[PDB]
């Protein structure tokens, strides 16, 4: 957040939420759909892998 100055990066986060919406067989978008969208970003997956949650563990 400090490194960063509608948002251009937010468009990619909302686009990934539509892909996960057609996976868990849900007609709507809830909170669980926005959780898997953060792991697909290259600038956001490093934070989750720092504590102790890898890709397979997530």
């Amino acid at each position: 957040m400090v490194r960063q100055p509608h948002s251009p990066e937010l468009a990619k986060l909302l686009h990934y939420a539509h892909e996960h919406m057609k996976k868990q067989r849900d007609l709507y978008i809830a909170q669980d759909h926005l959780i898997l969208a953060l792991a697909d970003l290259p600038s956001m997956a490093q934070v989750l892998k720092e504590g102790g949650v890898t890709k397979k563990s997530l």
Partner: protein
């Protein structure tokens, strides 16, 4: 993300890979699935073309040319 299959659609997917390998092919075209799925005893796809309209003897002939 997770993918879960059933029983009728599972045997059809495995049959499409064997049909494309016995005829010496490269890519798996989607036309190699509706042919095997239609050749079933009391299949659910046969009643779809007969309800919404369209002859079932002319649609299958267009899949072999692909």
């Amino acid at each position: 993300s997770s993918m879960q299959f059933t029983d009728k659609a599972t045997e059809t997917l495995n049959a499409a890979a064997k049909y494309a390998a016995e005829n010496s092919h490269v890519q798996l075209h989607p036309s190699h699935v509706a042919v095997v799925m239609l050749d079933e005893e009391n299949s659910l796809f046969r009643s779809i073309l007969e309800k919404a309209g369209g002859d079932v003897v002319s649609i299958e002939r267009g899949f072999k040319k692909i």
